[PDB]
Amino acid sequence: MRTGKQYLESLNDGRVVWVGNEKIDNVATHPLTRDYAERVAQFYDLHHRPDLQDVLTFVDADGVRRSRQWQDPKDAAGLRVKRKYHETILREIAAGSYGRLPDAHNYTFTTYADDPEVWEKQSIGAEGRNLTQNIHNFLKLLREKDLNCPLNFVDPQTDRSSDAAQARSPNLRIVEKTDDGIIVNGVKAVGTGIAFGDYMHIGCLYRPGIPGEQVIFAAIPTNTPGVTVFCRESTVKNDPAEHPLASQGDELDSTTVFDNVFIPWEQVFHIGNPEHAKLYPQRIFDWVHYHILIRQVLRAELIVGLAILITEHIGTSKLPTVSARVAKLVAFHLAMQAHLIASEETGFHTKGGRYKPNPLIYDFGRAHFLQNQMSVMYELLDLAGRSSLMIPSEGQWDDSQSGQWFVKLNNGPKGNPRERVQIGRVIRDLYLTDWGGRQFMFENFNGTPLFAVFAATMTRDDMSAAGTYGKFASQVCGIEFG
Amino acid sequence: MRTGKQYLESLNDGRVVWVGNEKIDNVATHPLTRDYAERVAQFYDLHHRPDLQDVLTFVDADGVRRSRQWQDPKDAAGLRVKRKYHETILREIAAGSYGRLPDAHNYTFTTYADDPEVWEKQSIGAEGRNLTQNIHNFLKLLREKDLNCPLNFVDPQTDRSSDAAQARSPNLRIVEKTDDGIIVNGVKAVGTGIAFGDYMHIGCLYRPGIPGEQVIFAAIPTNTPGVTVFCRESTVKNDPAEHPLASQGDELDSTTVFDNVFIPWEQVFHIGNPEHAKLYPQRIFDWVHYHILIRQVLRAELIVGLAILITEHIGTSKLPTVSARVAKLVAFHLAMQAHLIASEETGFHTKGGRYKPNPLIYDFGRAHFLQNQMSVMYELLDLAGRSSLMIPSEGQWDDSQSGQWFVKLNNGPKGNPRERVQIGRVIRDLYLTDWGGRQFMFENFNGTPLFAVFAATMTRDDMSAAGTYGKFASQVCGIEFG
Amino acid sequence: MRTGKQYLESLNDGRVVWVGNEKIDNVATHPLTRDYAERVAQFYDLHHRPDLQDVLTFVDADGVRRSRQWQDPKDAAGLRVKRKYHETILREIAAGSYGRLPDAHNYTFTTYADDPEVWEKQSIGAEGRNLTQNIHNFLKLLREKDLNCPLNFVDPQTDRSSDAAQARSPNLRIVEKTDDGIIVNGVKAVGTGIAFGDYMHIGCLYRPGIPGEQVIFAAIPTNTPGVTVFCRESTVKNDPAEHPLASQGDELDSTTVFDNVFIPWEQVFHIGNPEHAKLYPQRIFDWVHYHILIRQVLRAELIVGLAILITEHIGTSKLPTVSARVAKLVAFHLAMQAHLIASEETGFHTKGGRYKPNPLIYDFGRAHFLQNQMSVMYELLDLAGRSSLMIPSEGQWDDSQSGQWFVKLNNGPKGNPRERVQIGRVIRDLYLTDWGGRQFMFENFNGTPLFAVFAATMTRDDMSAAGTYGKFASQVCGIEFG
Amino acid sequence: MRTGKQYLESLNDGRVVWVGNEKIDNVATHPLTRDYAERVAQFYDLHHRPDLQDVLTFVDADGVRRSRQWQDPKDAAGLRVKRKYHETILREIAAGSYGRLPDAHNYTFTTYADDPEVWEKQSIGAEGRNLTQNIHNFLKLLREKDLNCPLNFVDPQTDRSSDAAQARSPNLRIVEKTDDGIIVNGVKAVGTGIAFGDYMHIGCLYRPGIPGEQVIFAAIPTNTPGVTVFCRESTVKNDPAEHPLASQGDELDSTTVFDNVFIPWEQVFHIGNPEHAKLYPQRIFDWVHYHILIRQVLRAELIVGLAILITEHIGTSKLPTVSARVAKLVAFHLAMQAHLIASEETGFHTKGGRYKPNPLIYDFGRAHFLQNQMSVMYELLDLAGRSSLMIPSEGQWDDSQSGQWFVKLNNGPKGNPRERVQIGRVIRDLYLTDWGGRQFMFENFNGTPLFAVFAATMTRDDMSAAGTYGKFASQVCGIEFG
């Protein structure tokens, strides 16, 4: 299993990356990137913890002990082992704040494994290139070298004004093929953790009128010549004492510029078929969406805890008004958790025999989180009061003359004044900080319930009078069904 | 297995029942009560349906074919057989509108079976009376006679007069104990289906300061001398053509008066111990609470169906704003269902080996429905538009001169004019009649479903910082957990 | 000023009215309709009350004393006198439950008075019919004869049936034209109080591709031969003691069928011009929309009062969790009231010199009621608890042997046990009867979601970046605007 | 009228203030503070602009031209002139983001002016002192020297420890009564802009069982010996090109500690009486609450604008689902504005002849904002998409090789790619930074808006059944009203 130290070294590979105005010499070391880079290191080192060997690792089919990240769930029971693996990672690293650690996006490659043939036999202009072997090859490399391969699938909003038939810029497209590979030019909008990966997982989602020279699926090293990762600015805090979570690292998002970059045939999985990009890219995001639900449920759990802690510390916890508000937080958690459990119980098997959770249920589970996060945030903030705003710094607390005033301001029915600040600082980082803010934003444009969901229900499912919801009502109304 | 015929006959036993201003001579026959009575009769006859023998009946341990209402789930799979039993009943009778058919409240008696001794052992003032044997005797009678025994547990609201503690409350209490039994005087409030039972299941839920003599658990014949069942006025409709659901029967709710009622020792399960009334009465309500959720999930399913039907018939189903609203109804059902399924997967076993669903989850599931049901039905009413209001009556539709106008008014893309009226009539019955409005109040007649459920749970498990919710937040805040 | 007796007698004119399957011989005396009929009578008699002379009547410009329903406001103060007139009617008649009493819809005719000629000169196919004198004549008749003229504007639902081009719709249309007048055939849908008017106010609203032959504005007697008023079934209760409100009358809604009805030229205001129906029919609903808001603010006030009465009678009013819930109701009333007041302070004058309230503000006020009334219903019901459901009849309350149990059950800190039943009966009528339910549907139809509220705003106002909301944002963003 | 320069120089007076760990040598010049200080300076310079003399200044009673912040409204029209003054300030300075510029809290001193004597006559422990003259003295000083005097009323949370809420509080209390003044020791919990005022307005709000020794009202210089202003860490951004709003200054919040400071008698307004602290501190906060509402209506206006702009630039504005959402935003602003209008129309006069707005209405107005602010934020962000996240810094946009790609990326149906970035940056600052998050918290921190607002309301208005809401419901229920 890869080591954190090894991960950090592999970052200094001459990849060209900007964080805002600032060009980055070495992601592992630069003040704007090093902290998150060290979280990914932390991710790898976690798997060497003797006490975590059972939850984090398994003996693979080749006799090699690996991260359960690579393990395939065969049934619901298997899926709970997988979930427990993911939850252990999240609980350990920054209060489950990071959504694109390696286990999150790496598992998406299993959709290829489920049926590698289709990706080659459905390519347009793939001639006699062995794309199927390209899949098998990378899956082995990915797994055995324990690589980190972030997703780069999102396209620009694509000009909603011009003649769509003339699709020039800014989308990434094949501008020429040769005997050695293809050349691509354009950009990938919104990619998370691109600067911190070994390879990037280039792909796309179907949209009506998608050219075909734009249907590209590949995995290329991050430092492939002609690639520039332009990151938004980093929101990491420099004072760990004042910001226990925000100072731990910003999971950067970026737009990736491909400047006529050459992609060897060996690194391509599929090209050219808009029809194939319909539904197959969709499956690629299944495990990502499932992982998000896991993260969401843990977050709901954290908020309940924070609410119970801050509220017991101040001594308002036994007020009917307060407890009723805590009840809403518990409700929210139980609602999130129920979508998670129900989805895991109503799953199915992929071609590769992998047991997949029910997408209808976990996708609505995600919609439920997005639609109510504002509500619960407001409740936590209301319960915390000034504890998330008027936080005395260490210098003020430790002051000889006035330090004792702060101790008195924060003392409660359970003593331990320090705890008020500790709790308040977590709530602040989470909800009153740039860093905490991007944690809405992340899962936000990713969905938009009303919008996406019903464009994402009648896609694999049937929400018509002839579907499952039509039976009972029809019978009750005395109308024939079927 | 009892027939509806036998059931109907058992109603004419001299029970004293008021419906509004009138004393009812025969509940089975009276215009105000006969319809619901025939719904219970229908419940019984259903089990004799040759094609329903598998879902509805089983062979008991004594080699007797009985209703599956008497069957014990011993694992999750068995629980789903139980639920399928209940759902078959629900879908078949008045669109799952009735909440206290015999299978809903009869199974709560297994709570006694799980551990009969404790009810006697914990009694105060009932020594030498064989309460344990009383339990076994009634369980046997209830089952073998196939009796219907509604719960009568709900107490009068507390009188908040400053001087309340210096006079009698209206609550039911033991007023005398004798060699033959106990004399009982007072009121049980908001009882559902009392007038239609063979026996009533007398009991109480704990409240701070509840006196020993008010703690009574027993089952007595509905027609016990001194018992008067005061029902609310009946909202049953007379025209089945215009009212397909509301004409099928009104599940009456009652205030039961006990005028110095004599109860033989043989009908008594427990008396005198407030401490016992803490956890145990909650166990009795578990199974009925779980049944309510089953019914609530079907109702959510019905609502989505009606929305899809009426929305497709009018031709508004295609509009994106309309699709989004139908989707959020799908969301509601999915959330209800998720609670149901999650509670079934995380259940536990009683001392009697019976597999119970998770009360934390299904009870918060109930609270989710109760808090949202009005908002949800408003969406349905809004989507149906004028079709739930401007409904042509049969005579207007059949009118030789003007009927054709109504056919045109109700014609849409689907091209079946009659259907719009069929759907309009069930929506109207469900949410625009007094019969329909009853469904909002009879299970939510106290203050705040969410908090009520939350307060009940923290008397059953730890919702404090020392409980399961404090662990993750404590860790994150650097606070010790134990 | 017309008397109630005069109104009642005018109803007996051989008009053809169905209520459900029942043909009505006289709307004034029939069991299904007499009660609402008597509410309109009450409306008239109210104006003869000496003590009410000031708020209800004024001396007209001809020196005759008439109801202030005919009085014109010329400024903000004048609008207040008008509203005070409306509110006094509403408060007097059935808790403000009726929304189409004569003063509500009669005043819409002043739309014609603001500019009568335009209706003439914009007509197509009415050359030489002096529709202007027609207008002036009816306006005088309307007022001096003190008639009641309900609106009949609404059209059958836009359905794309099998062939909405090969076959004709149910819409009212000009079928033939003569030297005497016009012949119309078709239907007006969802009219309110039609069966109770002396005349009906025929009109239409614009709709993409509406035929000129369907554009018709007129006022004809209700008993005009060939006219049939088909009412939905009546929901009025037969027992005033148990239903203090729902027994007072049902403001019926109807479908009006015109079987080749002849309208004399002298009863026509405009025909034939789709362009005219684009802006003027909306002006007609302006005053009714304003009256709707007034009724809504009142209803919010009623609801607050009910919550305060029931919570005080029970004794929970001082509980912090109850105070907070009641605050929500007060918040809703104040929000409704704020829109009301703000619209009156920011109005404008019509050509007729009449001061109109701000439509943007009072229409959004209306939308606020529609979007929050379920939440308000829910909040009141939750506070009232069992009192709105478990209501003892007079017979039960007065029973000699068991009646005293109900006194004890309903006793509280403020004594007067009977009051709890009184309050509960009002709440039950308002929210848990057929009659109460239609007071939801009154507006539960007049606009698909918001597919017609910003398409009815952005296109009827600026509501663009160049509009009034674009100024501040543009500045702050350092952009354009100008 | 004071000058920005003059104000800046007044700051360097040896006041001891910390921003986090940093002791501040000069509030006017320090990097953590100078930006907000220059905003207060901007506030003063605004008054000297010739183009704004009309709206910002007036000739006072003494003949001297002054800022309209010192002007008294004597009627509704006058109040509107005052509102136009405040809004002009807000719209000019950082998009109305600052809530405690001098005009916001300075006007609260008019409370004293309304009735000066009562503050002395009600004092306890100051027998023989003339305090009334002090009010007139400071009032003159305040106005003529054009001083800035922030509020400092909020006390430490009354922790239910035992001896923390008993005597040994951090609460500011009178420890010593000299014949030259008093000596005070303790803490003022939360204070906004204290470190930026010439004086601080010391005061307190009543709470059950508050000592008379903690009831102190006064105005002392900020650089008084023994006073330390401890500020939370500052959230000011460094780069105005990336942060157009957040770089403009952080309106800091403080805990002020009084280590045995001596207040001269000529600065005391009242001491010793808890009964006085009941209603009079409420009147102090009246004008502040009104100003907050003015500010909240502007922000709601701003939010609508941003939503329109971004939605139009992306070309998503025509979508029915989107325009529906924008209409909700317009509804929020309309609702907020209506509370504002209505409060101004239903005000009253103070003893001093000042026309004050209606507090019941503008306080429920504030509550409406506090409750909905989170949801409307979410809608803005969801509408903006990646624009508020994936923002190309200046350097990336200007880049010679790649810049072009960002231009094509932000191109929309309306061109002007740069605008997407400009709007996006404004939104990010508002809701995705800590500077922004402070704004939706600093508002409410005391408890629950709707409840507390209503709790404070029951004190000013009669909200019982004997109150104004009891009338209508009582008549409807047949209950006597008095």
From Swiss-Prot, chains A, B, C, D:
Entry keyword annotation includes Repeat: no
The keyword tRNA-binding is annotated on this UniProt entry: no
Chain positions recorded as FAD binding sites: 151-153, 157-160, 192, 457-460
E.C. no: 1.14.14.-
Entry's transmembrane regions: none
GO biological process: catabolic process; protein homotetramerization
Molecular-function annotations in GO: oxidoreductase activity, acting on paired donors, with incorporation or reduction of molecular oxygen, reduced flavin or flavoprotein as one donor, and incorporation of one atom of oxygen; oxidoreductase activity, acting on the CH-CH group of donors
Pathway, per record: Xenobiotic degradation
The organism's place on the tree of life at top rank: Bacteria
Record: residues binding substrate: 100-104, 203-204
Family membership: Belongs to the FADH(2)-utilizing monooxygenase family.
PANTHER family, A to Z: 4-HYDROXYPHENYLACETATE 3-MONOOXYGENASE-RELATED
Function: Oxygenase component of a two-component system that degrades 2,4,5-trichlorophenol. Uses FADH(2) supplied by TftC to oxidize 2,4,5-trichlorophenol (2,4,5-TCP) to 2,5-dichloro-p-benzoquinone, which is chemically reduced to 2,5-dichloro-p-hydroquinone (2,5-DiCHQ). Then, TftD oxidizes the latter to 5-chloro-2-hydroxy-p-benzoquinone.
Assembly notes: Homotetramer. The chlorophenol-4-monooxygenase is composed of an oxygenase component TftD and a reductase component TftC.
Protein name (Swiss-Prot/TrEMBL): FADH(2)-dependent monooxygenase TftD
Gene: tftD
